[PDB]
Swiss-Prot record:
Belongs to the integrin alpha chain family. Residues 4-175 form the VWFA domain. It is found in: Cell membrane. This is Integrin alpha-L. Integrin ITGAL/ITGB2 is a receptor for ICAM1, ICAM2, ICAM3 and ICAM4. Integrin ITGAL/ITGB2 is a receptor for F11R. Integrin ITGAL/ITGB2 is a receptor for the secreted form of ubiquitin-like protein ISG15; the interaction is mediated by ITGAL. Involved in a variety of immune phenomena including leukocyte-endothelial cell interaction, cytotoxic T-cell mediated killing, and antibody dependent killing by granulocytes and monocytes. Contributes to natural killer cell cytotoxicity. Involved in leukocyte adhesion and transmigration of leukocytes including T-cells and neutrophils. It comes from Homo sapiens (Human). Heterodimer of an alpha and a beta subunit. The ITGAL alpha subunit associates with the ITGB2 beta subunit. Interacts with THBD. Interacts with CD226. (Microbial infection) Interacts with SARS-CoV Orf7a protein. The integrin I-domain (insert) is a VWFA domain. Integrins with I-domains do not undergo protease cleavage. The I-domain is necessary and sufficient for interaction with ICAM1 and F11R. Glycans are attached at N36. Leukocytes. In resting T-cells, up to 40% of surface ITGAL is constitutively phosphorylated. Phosphorylation causes conformational changes needed for ligand binding and is necessary for activation by some physiological agents. The chain holds residues 153 to 331 of 1170 of the full protein.
Length: 179
């Protein structure tokens, strides 16, 4: 029943300060609701570059989402989603970072725009992948559909297109129900 969950969250230049803070608050809320469970967490900010803001070992030690994220600095650059997902798959889901070999791997990708880079995410395909596309850049169907390649199948389950986070059916509950 162990789940190792990574939040992979956009820090691009398009995010207003309140919008970036709402992404932080969303991750904290999921963690608080899912705390003291078989879930362990890590979080990675991506924009141009990728930074593990806290790893699974950190999570087990402090178990305080506000302290784990207190040092995050909004990167304010690009949206290199291909590089970021590869980074998570190969550099974050590792025993050296506290990941548990027995656990089910889950990736929650949070983004406010289309990917600026290119390539493939072969190395991450066996991870259960949800993508949340937040805000105005996903107002047309075409834009939304560009996120399907990053998510598990079917997109009707794994791609979430949101005006705001409050409209999402509660993620901790849904994960505990389904994973
Ligand atoms: Mg953006």
């Amino acid at each position: 029943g162990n789940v190792d969950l990574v939040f992979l969250f956009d820090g691009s230049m398009s995010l207003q300060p309140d919008e970036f803070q709402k992404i932080l608050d969303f991750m904290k809320d999921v963690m608080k609701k899912c705390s003291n469970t078989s879930y362990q967490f890590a979080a990675v900010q991506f924009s141009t570059s990728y930074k593990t803001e806290f790893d699974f070992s950190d999570y087990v030690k402090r178990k305080d989402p506000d302290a784990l994220l207190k040092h995050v600095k909004h990167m304010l650059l690009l949206t290199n989603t291909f590089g970021a997902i590869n980074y998570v798959a190969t550099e974050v889901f590792r025993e050296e970072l506290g990941a548990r070999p027995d656990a089910t791997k889950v990736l929650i990708i949070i983004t406010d725009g289309e990917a600026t880079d290119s390539g493939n995410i072969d190395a991450a395909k066996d991870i259960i992948r949800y993508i949340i596309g937040i805000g105005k850049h996903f107002q047309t169907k075409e834009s939304q559909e560009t996120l399907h390649k990053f998510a598990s199948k079917p997109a009707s389950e794994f791609v979430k297109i949101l005006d705001t986070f409050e409209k999402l059916k509660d993620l901790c509950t849904e994960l505990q129900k389904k994973i």
